[PDB]
Amino acid sequence: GREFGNLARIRHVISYSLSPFEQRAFPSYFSKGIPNVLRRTRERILRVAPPFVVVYLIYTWGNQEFEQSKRKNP
Amino acid sequence: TNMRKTHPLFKIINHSFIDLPAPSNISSWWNFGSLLGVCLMVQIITGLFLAMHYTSDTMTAFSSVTHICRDVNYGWLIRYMHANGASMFFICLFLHVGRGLYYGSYTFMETWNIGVLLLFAVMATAFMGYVLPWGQMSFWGATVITNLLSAIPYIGTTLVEWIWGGFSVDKATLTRFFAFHFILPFIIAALAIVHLLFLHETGSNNPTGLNSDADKIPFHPYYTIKDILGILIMFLILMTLVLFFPDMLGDPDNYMPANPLNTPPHIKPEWYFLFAYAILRSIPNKLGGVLALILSILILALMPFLHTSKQRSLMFRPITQILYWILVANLLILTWIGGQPVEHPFIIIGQLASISYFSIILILMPISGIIEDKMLKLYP
Amino acid sequence: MTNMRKTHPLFKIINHSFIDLPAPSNISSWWNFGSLLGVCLMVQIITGLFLAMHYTSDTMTAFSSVTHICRDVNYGWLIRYMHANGASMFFICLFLHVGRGLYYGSYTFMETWNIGVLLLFAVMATAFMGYVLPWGQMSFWGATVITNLLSAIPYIGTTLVEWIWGGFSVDKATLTRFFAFHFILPFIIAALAIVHLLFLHETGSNNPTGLNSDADKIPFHPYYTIKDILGILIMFLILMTLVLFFPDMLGDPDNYMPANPLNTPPHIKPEWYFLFAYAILRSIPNKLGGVLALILSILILALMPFLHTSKQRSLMFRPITQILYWILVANLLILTWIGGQPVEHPFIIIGQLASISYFSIILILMPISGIIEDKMLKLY
Amino acid sequence: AAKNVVSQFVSSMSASADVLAMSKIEIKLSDIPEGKNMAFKWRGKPLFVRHRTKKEIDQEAAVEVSQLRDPQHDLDRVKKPEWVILIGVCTHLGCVPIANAGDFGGYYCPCHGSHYDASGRIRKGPAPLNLEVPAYEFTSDDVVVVG
Amino acid sequence: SDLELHPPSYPWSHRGLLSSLDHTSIRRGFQVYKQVCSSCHSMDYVAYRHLVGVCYTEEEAKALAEEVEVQDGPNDDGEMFMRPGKLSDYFPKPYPNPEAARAANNGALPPDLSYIVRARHGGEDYVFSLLTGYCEPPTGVSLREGLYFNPYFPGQAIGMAPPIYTEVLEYDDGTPATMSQVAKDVATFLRWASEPEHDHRKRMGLKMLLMMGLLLPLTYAMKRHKWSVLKSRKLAYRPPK
Amino acid sequence: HLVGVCYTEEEAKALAEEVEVQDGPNDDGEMFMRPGKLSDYFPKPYPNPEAARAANNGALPPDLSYIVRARHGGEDYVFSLLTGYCEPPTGVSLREGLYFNPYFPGQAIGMAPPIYTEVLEYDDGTPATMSQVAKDVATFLRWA
Ligand SMILES: CCCCCCCCCCCCCCCCCC(=O)OC[C@H](COP(=O)(O)OCCN)OC(=O)CCCCCCCCCCCCCCCCC
Ligand code: HEC
Ligand code: HEC
Ligand code: HEM
Ligand code: HEM
Ligand code: HEM
Ligand code: HEM
Ligand code: FES
């Protein structure tokens, strides 16, 4: 019903591909991976990390407050 | 002439797994639901090889479990594979749900509703399966969960007596829980077929949230080999969890036989229930706590009506991204609080976490979408 | 607006299958029978589920659990005897359904026929293990007899039988794994029946005349819906007068004793839907040959599509092959009677003649009769 | 990996160590004299074992095969005719036979009055068959291991 | 009291990821259990056949099983009789029912030690801390007679008398039976009693680690092959303007 | 199982308290000998089948819970067995400890003839003839 041939109408688009036997499986892996990993980390770390940082802070505070609650009160 | 497009058994396989058009840019998170199916299949297989030696009588339940772990050839592997596979199944399920929330996949409303029915079914299946080995925490968690389920006025006591088969958890409860734990995964498999059918009616979703009809690829061999790699990775974590540390996710107190006379000093379920249990400890009302549990599962089904944006995914909505990660952080907080004793300061922390949870899902996310629309010069 | 019956992705399947399915107008009451089988199947599952809620698969507490179901569980006797008599009525509907398929030439649908033969093997295995399950005398000794004739296979039979047994005899490992297999097999039968209906609906159903029925076709609703409700109510009448008036006319009295390996019964026989197979087995003086003849009896039932040497599909206009068909049906009745008899005079020679005539009518005389009427009607 | 895990599950379906423990752990001792028949508990069934003499060997060999209710000679029962190892179970109702009695010096069933010989062939009673000879393996001659 | 004391982490020889158990220590700890701990505690889920190929041979475990009597039966007159134990028998009960165990131990029931390092927080370390941790009670607490002060037991009031002292038993291999050595050996044996599959599990884990370290890069290489069909695809646009 | 069928709760409670049932163990760990209750099963004559075979000369008396449903003929078989004890014919010799009942398979039963005229006394004044006793016990076994 929603197979190939009637998904969308596309005009004037040219696409180029190679055989997998002509190109490398890992072409310039770390030289183009570590900059991209660092770039993706740069775009997402300020929106991901600080909730988990404040969760770690609340977790350590709750643990030390539980240990102080179990402690004696002279 | 070919049997792929003509044979009616192979036609469904061809249009569901071989020649199904899929977006070319879906990331590794789209593996997880497929992983869930494999996990379900694995559980069923291991469950069948657990049903060949398990005896569902109270005098011979724990002894039959020890006979599996000690005398049956690689019965320890089957049982601990079943338990850690249930845990990895809930890991995949939580990440599948969170990916559906992040990338705006709840616009497929029927797929979302079949999903939340599947979530209820697998939670019930896990609870009854944990009742089955008849340990101390199995019996006491069953007693706690059912006698708090008794909180509906005038209906609750008769309902919990009819669920129990008596005055408490006893041999009738164990037999009927074995039958129900056996019967539920096949209903789960049928609902998963309906889930996949409702998805394949409308196609799947890409991470950008745009229309993926401009660039679509066949499912085979691309997502076939991607799912094979995901299955291998899932098996790596599963076999590491079963073959090196079989008890980071378990409870030692379930290795004692069930004693109705002795109550444990601390009673808690598994971690995938624990956050809900924290909400169950948040409100000091019985019926209010039960409704807090039920709405804490059901507001995920409510969220298709909470979309107030004109952009689907969160890839271009950074404030709602921050608020979503605050929600996931709050879920981790509730999971930690649920396995803690009922003592200060965990009460106010759990109440604040439940208030933040319901405020973020109910109130703050549509307001964030509205003001993002306003800042993109869309809202009036 | 739109038509919700034909455009909904879930309701389209029910509309295509049971509502707007084109059906022949002239099909007789025998066309009810297969639908009754499906109803009987789910009836079995429902009763089995409640019989799974109080039964313990353990040789110390199997017979006592069955007596506890019969005496102490509220209406447990009703559900248990409904399960047993509905198994017998399931085989009654099975034999009438297969006889309809043989008489009216419905075996030309080859994939549907072979799928049905697979369903037949699965339900026979399910009923055999379920009969082993209550752990009476006849259950234990019938399991012993069937596994010994499985052990008659050369060089792999002994290993296969000690691996099916889980030991050196029939014990609680065999009982537990038979409980697990008897539980899980009807869902496989249900999925296989879904495939069975899928192949039939993509090939269409057959009229008793054998002609092309596309000239006169009617929707399934509301004709065959109400016709199948009437058939369901008649099937309930026979099942309820079997469960409420004669609970033990088909049952075995020696099953009401606890299982004893020391005491063997004077007569060992399986239930009445295995008796013709046992009589075919008992005739040949070779155990490997007897098992070979049993499996090839059900396989020549499967091979019946390849023996069709007539230009007319049904037997409506073929009276010689009609006569041979009723000789075959009466021969099946004779084998059923002989299978419940001991090996005494004159049952050996009668059983040998019955098996020889059964194989000769299925293999030899029916295509010869088809060729004879082909010549006799100037067809070739 | 697939062959390994299939082997794991197939070996799991096979016989466990508990059921393998109940067989082939029986030790028959040498302090049992001539003609003294006792029962061991093998596979949940009684097992009569007795040490015999050459006179009983010739007496059991004098009984013909074709005229029997169940045709079996003495050499086809055991390859050591001076050791008799049978199952002490009544084949009709399941009672316990009593050895060293009767005309031929064998088993006696008190529940109905069956007379057995020293080897175990049916001689009188409603039993339509003989007594089944279990298999055994030979260690040093003081010890024989049944099964 | 309400405040607790967590046991520390002792460096066992089986603490590592692939380090198996020390079977000489399991044999010595079995001798400790048979000579000391079997008077009050039970081992219902361990038979004498489990010791074959782990600590003892077939004939040694046969002699160990034959050293004790088992109430078998019934006889042909319907009576229970003593018999020498065989390899299929489990370890014998000290008391037939828990009520006589509570009567003979002043109310407290000594638990069945088949999972006691699997059912306690901290594992066999805690067991070691229970056995070498007995001390004089501090000033302020005055426990009831029949109890003893152990700071590692919850509530610090244990009903168990201190069972291990120096040369409490003799070892057949000429090992000095100090109290710490006996406690370490019985902790190793109780670790084996909960996990008889421990060494096999670690061997399968080592094979799994090598096997997955082989097949993650290879499956990743096939994925990168089939998807580097598309990951070097170049698209261009030619509008007629 | 007898309340609402043949007795009231007081009569069945008195019947249960007539007989003694072993129960326990106590806090000291010993089995005591309490009076019976309504929830108790019917008392076994022998603790194990081996002493049953010893007390009845090899033959084990079976459980008469489904002895109607375990035999062909039902309660007709029980009635013909209890009222069919006759002398053996000539040509067959019966050893001591066996009795000739033609309805038993093999015709040499090991059960001594249990019922005779006025073997017990009825509460309602029914004349306790042998056939009446056999009919009543066959009806009761059919109920059981
Ligand atoms: C005449 C009526 C007198 C009474 C009047 C009252 C009315 C009764 C009905 C009248 C009907 C009038 C005719 C209309 C019906 C149609 C024609 C018909 O049925 O004719 C009778 C039929 C003739 O045979 P037909 O099939 O027509 O053609 C064969 C080719 N010559 O003949 C037959 O079919 C006969 C079949 C005989 C079969 C005998 C089988 C013997 C062997 C059986 C062995 C089975 C068991 C084997 C066991 C082996 C192991 C022990
Ligand atoms: C009789 C004097 C005993 C001897 C010999 C051994 N133990 Fe024991 N033990 C005994 C009692 C009465 C109790 C219960 C005390 C209570 O308050 O519950 C115990 C308990 C234990 C436990 C469980 C501790 C826990 O926290 O649950 C362990 C692990 C234990 N004992 C170990 C142990 C060992 C290793 C022994 C052999 C040296 C041993 N016990 C001997 C009584 C007696
Ligand atoms: C002790 C003298 C008994 C009395 C009192 C009753 N019965 Fe009995 N019965 C007894 C024995 C030792 C046996 C074993 C079988 C044998 O070889 O004799 C039986 C058997 C029965 C049976 C089963 C018959 C069968 O074919 O299996 C029945 C139905 C039976 N007995 C009935 C019965 C009734 C109704 C009694 C009360 C009047 C009764 N028995 C008393 C010994 C004794
Ligand atoms: C029909 C298939 C299944 C069968 C036959 C089955 C059977 C069993 C049995 C016999 C046990 C008890 C043995 C044990 O101690 O592990 C068990 C435990 C368990 N099962 Fe399943 N199960 C099935 C499917 C599932 C599924 C789908 C889940 C996940 C939701 C699940 C989760 C569990 C859990 C969590 C336990 C407890 C593990 C433990 O405590 O050891 N089971 N199951
Ligand atoms: C029982 C466990 C579940 C199984 C086996 C399952 C199975 C699947 C499968 C096979 C897919 C298609 C592959 C994919 O897109 O990743 C899928 C997609 C989806 N599932 Fe689930 N699912 C489960 C739970 C859920 C739940 C609980 C929800 C609801 C939160 C859900 C909602 C969805 C949605 C919205 C999609 C489509 C999103 C997309 O394709 O982009 N699923 N599921
Ligand atoms: C998944 C569904 C089913 C379940 C859970 C199930 C379960 C059981 C159980 C627990 C018993 C033993 C109870 C008793 O007989 O006292 C039993 C007996 C039996 N079942 Fe099933 N069953 C199922 C489906 C079927 C089907 C489809 C058949 C075949 C028509 C069947 C045939 C039998 C038979 C013949 C018995 C023996 C009844 C007797 O005691 O005489 N069962 N089943
Ligand atoms: C196991 C239980 C079975 C069920 C639930 C079942 C179900 C059905 C149903 C619902 C139909 C359509 C209604 C009808 O026309 O009768 C049907 C037709 C059919 N079945 Fe089955 N069936 C079963 C067993 C078998 C077996 C064993 C065979 C093979 C001998 C078989 C072969 C056929 C054929 C050939 C038809 C088409 C007949 C026609 O429509 O003209 N079925 N079955
Ligand atoms: S009872 Fe033993 S021969 Fe009949």
Calculate the alpha carbon distances from C121 to B48, B323, C124, C339 in Å: 21, 58, 5, 19
Place of tokens 């036609």: B11
Q: Is residue B375 helix, strand or coil?
A: helix
φ, ψ at F19 (rounded to 5°): -95, 155
Buried b (16+ CB within 10 A) or exposed e, B350-374: bbebbebbbebbeebbbebbeebbe
Calculate the alpha carbon distances from C305 to C374, E115, F129 in Å: 18, 61, 69
Calculate the alpha carbon distances from B193 to B34, B199, B378 in Å: 12, 10, 39
- From the list C163, C166, C262, the residue facing D19 with the nearest CB is C166
- Binding-site residues on chain A for chain B (CB distance < 8 A): 2-4, 7-8, 10, 47-48, 51-52, 54-55, 58-59, 62, 65-66, 69
CA dihedral C349, C352, C358, C361 (to 10 degrees): -80
What is the torsional sign of CA C289, C295, C301, C303?
Answer: negative
Question: Which of B213, B217, B352 best probes binding to A when mutated, by most A CB atoms within 10 angstroms?
Answer: B213
How close, in Å, is residue F51 to chain E by CA atoms? 4
- The active-site residue, picked from B220, B226, B286, B307, is B226
User: C248 to chain F: which residues are within 8 Å by CB?
Assistant: 69
Residues with CB under 6 A from ligand 2: E 36-37, 39-41, 105, 108, 110-111, 116, 127, 130-131, 153, 158-161, 163-164, 186
Place of tokens 């089957």: B78
Beta carbons of A66 and B346 less than 8 Å apart: yes
φ, ψ at B254 (rounded to 5°): -80, -5
- Per-position DSSP letters for E46-114, written without gaps between them: -BGGGGBTTTB-HHHHHHHHHTSEEEE---TTS--EEEE--TTSBPPPSSSSHHHHHHHTTTPPPPPTT
Residue C268 carries which side chain, given as an amino acid letter?
A: I
Q: Is residue F1 helix, strand or coil?
A: coil
Full 3-state SS string of chain C = CCCHHHHCCCHHHHHHHHHCCEEECCCCHHHHHHHHHHHHHHHHHHHHHHHCCCCCCCCCCCHHHHHHHHHCCCCHHHHHHHHHHHHHHHHHHHHHHHHHHHHCCHHHCHHHHHHHHHHHHHHHHHHHHHHHCCCEHHHHHHHHHHHHHHHCCCCCHHHHHHHHHCCCCCCHHHHHHHHHHHHHHHHHHHHHHHHHHHHHHHHCCCCCCCCCHHHCEEEHHHHHHHHHHHHHHHHHHHHHHHHHCCCCCCCCHHHHCECCCCCCCCCCCCCCCCHHHHHHHHHCCCHHHHHHHHHHHHHHHHHHHHHCCCCCCCCCCCHHHHHHHHHHHHHHHHHHHHHCCCCCCCHHHHHHHHHHHHHHHHHHHHHHHHHHHHHHCCCC
CB C35 near ligand 7, within 6 Å: yes
Which among C29, C210, C44 is positioned nearest to C127, based on CA atoms?
C44
- From the list C67, C253, C266, the residue facing F70 with the nearest CB is C253
Q: Is residue F71 helix, strand or coil?
A: coil
What is the F98 CA–ligand 3 centroid distance (Å)?
12
- C-alpha neighbours within 13 Å on the C-beta side of residue B293: 20
Question: Which of F48, F57, F60 best probes binding to E when mutated, by most E CB atoms within 10 angstroms?
Answer: F48
Residue nearest to atom 41 of ligand 2 (CA): E37
The two three-digit tokens of residue C77, written as one number: 């006797």
Beta carbons of F25 and E77 less than 8 Å apart: no
Which among B76, B111, B89, B92 is positioned nearest to B44, based on CA atoms?
B89
Method underlying the structure: cryo-EM
CA dihedral F4, F10, F16, F18 (to 10 degrees): -140
What is the F62 CA–ligand 3 centroid distance (Å)?
7
Buried b (16+ CB within 10 A) or exposed e, B248-281: ebbbbbbbbbbeeeeeeeeebbbbbbbbbbbbbb
Calculate the alpha carbon distances from E120 to A17, B79, B249, E130, E193 in Å: 61, 20, 15, 11, 14
Give the Cα separation of B51 and C3 in Å (integer): 46
CB B328 near ligand 5, within 6 Å: no
User: B213 to chain A: which residues are within 8 Å by CB?
Assistant: 7-8
Q: Residue D108: beta bridge partners?
A: D98, D115
Q: So which residues of C are the catalytic ones?
A: 201, 205, 227-228, 271
Neighbours of B85 (CB within 10 A): 22
Which ligand 3 atom minimizes the distance to the CA of F70? Answer: 27
Which ligand 8 atom minimizes the distance to the CA of D111? Answer: 1
Give the Cα separation of C84 and C65 in Å (integer): 16
Beta carbons of F50 and E97 less than 8 Å apart: no
Which residues have C-beta within 8 Å of that of residue D26, sequence separation ≥ 6?
A: D40, D42, D145, D146, D147
Beta carbons of E221 and A27 less than 8 Å apart: no
Angle between helices B222-243 and E198-228 (to 10 degrees): 160
Give the Cα separation of A61 and F63 in Å (integer): 70
Do you find a cis peptide bond into C258, omega within 30 degrees of 0? no
- Per-position DSSP letters for B98-159, written without gaps between them: HHHHHTTGGGSHHHHHHHHHHHHHHHHHHHHHHHTT-BHHHHHHHHHHHHHHTTSTTTHHHH
Residue C7 class from Cβ within 10 Å (0-12 exposed, 13-18 middle, 19+ buried)? exposed
Return the ligand number nearest the Cα of F79. Answer: 3
How close, in Å, is residue F49 to chain E by CA atoms? 7
- From the list D1, D17, D25, the residue facing E86 with the nearest CB is D25
Which among F114, F115, F110, F113 is positioned nearest to F60, based on CA atoms?
F110
Q: Is residue E182 helix, strand or coil?
A: helix
**How many helices (H) and strands (E) in chain D?**
4, 9
Confirm or reject CATH 3.10.129.10 for domain D22-146, answering yes or no: no
Task: Tell me if C279 sits within 8 A of C335, measured CB to CB.
Answer: yes
Residue E127 carries which side chain, given as an amino acid letter?
A: V
Give the Cα separation of C335 and C337 in Å (integer): 5
CB C175 near ligand 6, within 6 Å: no
Which among C164, C127, C168, C169 is positioned nearest to C144, based on CA atoms?
C169
Neighbours of D8 (CB within 10 A): 16
DSSP D106: E
Which among D74, F14, B24, B54 is positioned nearest to C175, based on CA atoms?
B54
- Per-position DSSP letters for D24-91, written without gaps between them: S-----S---BT--EEEEETTEEEEEEE--HHHHHHHHTS-STTSSS---HHHH-SSTTEEEE----T
Beta carbons of B71 and D9 less than 8 Å apart: no
Neighbours of B37 (CB within 10 A): 16
DSSP D132: P
Place of tokens 């609970």: C247
- Binding-site residues on chain E for chain B (CB distance < 8 A): 17, 45-46, 50, 111, 114-115, 118-121, 154, 194, 196-197, 201-202, 204-205, 208-209, 212, 215-216, 219-220, 222-223, 226-227, 230
User: F47 to chain E: which residues are within 8 Å by CB?
Assistant: 78
The residue to mutate among C78, C85, C182, having the most atoms of ligand 6 within 8 angstroms of its beta carbon, is C182
DSSP E138: P
The domain in which residue B20 lies consists of: 1-380
What is the B129 CA–ligand 4 centroid distance (Å)?
4
Calculate the alpha carbon distances from F144 to B348, C307, F68, F73 in Å: 63, 56, 8, 16
Place of tokens 């109510």: C233
Give the Cα separation of F111 and F109 in Å (integer): 6
Buried b (16+ CB within 10 A) or exposed e, B14-31: bbeeeebbbbbebeeebb
How close, in Å, is residue B221 to chain A by CA atoms? 13
CB C87 near ligand 6, within 6 Å: yes
The domain in which residue A65 lies consists of: 1-74
CB C130 near ligand 6, within 6 Å: yes
The residue to mutate among F44, F111, F137, having the most atoms of ligand 3 within 8 angstroms of its beta carbon, is F111
Chains E and F form CB pairs within 8 A to the count of: 38
Which among B42, B148, B97 is positioned nearest to B272, based on CA atoms?
B97
Give the Cα separation of B82 and B242 in Å (integer): 9
Overall domain count for chain B: 1
Task: Tell me if B90 sits within 8 A of B44, measured CB to CB.
Answer: no
Distance of CA B41 to the CA centre of its chain: 15
Full 3-state SS string of A16-36 = ECCCCCCCCCCCCHHHHHHHH
Give the Cα separation of F106 and E97 in Å (integer): 47
H helix or E strand, kind and range, residue E115: none
Neighbours of C246 (CB within 10 A): 11
Task: Tell me if D118 sits within 8 A of D53, measured CB to CB.
Answer: no
Task: Tell me if B240 sits within 8 A of B248, measured CB to CB.
Answer: no
Give the Cα separation of B155 and B178 in Å (integer): 25
Overall domain count for chain A: 1
The two three-digit tokens of residue C41, written as one number: 């199947």
Largest CA distance in chain F: 64
Which among C13, C204, C6, E226 is positioned nearest to B12, based on CA atoms?
C13
The two three-digit tokens of residue A54, written as one number: 């404040």
Residue E209 class from Cβ within 10 Å (0-12 exposed, 13-18 middle, 19+ buried)? middle
Task: Tell me if A47 sits within 8 A of B321, measured CB to CB.
Answer: yes
Q: Is residue F33 helix, strand or coil?
A: strand
φ, ψ at D46 (rounded to 5°): -65, 150
Q: Residue E71: beta bridge partners?
A: E82
Q: If you measure CA to CA, which chain C residue comes closest to B52? A: C177
φ, ψ at B295 (rounded to 5°): -70, -30
Which residues have C-beta within 8 Å of that of residue C372, sequence separation ≥ 6?
A: C320
DSSP B213: G
Radius of gyration of chain D (CA): 18
Place of tokens 């799928």: C115
The two three-digit tokens of residue F116, written as one number: 């005779």
Give the Cα separation of B68 and B77 in Å (integer): 10
The two three-digit tokens of residue B214, written as one number: 């401009």
Beta carbons of A7 and B213 less than 8 Å apart: yes
Beta carbons of F110 and D109 less than 8 Å apart: no
- C-alpha neighbours within 13 Å on the C-beta side of residue D126: 16
DSSP A5: T
Which ligand 6 atom minimizes the distance to the CA of C189? Answer: 27
The data reach a resolution, in angstroms, of 3.2
CB B199 near ligand 5, within 6 Å: yes
Any A CB within 8 A of E218 CB:
no
Any C CB within 8 A of B311 CB:
no
Give the Cα separation of B88 and B46 in Å (integer): 14
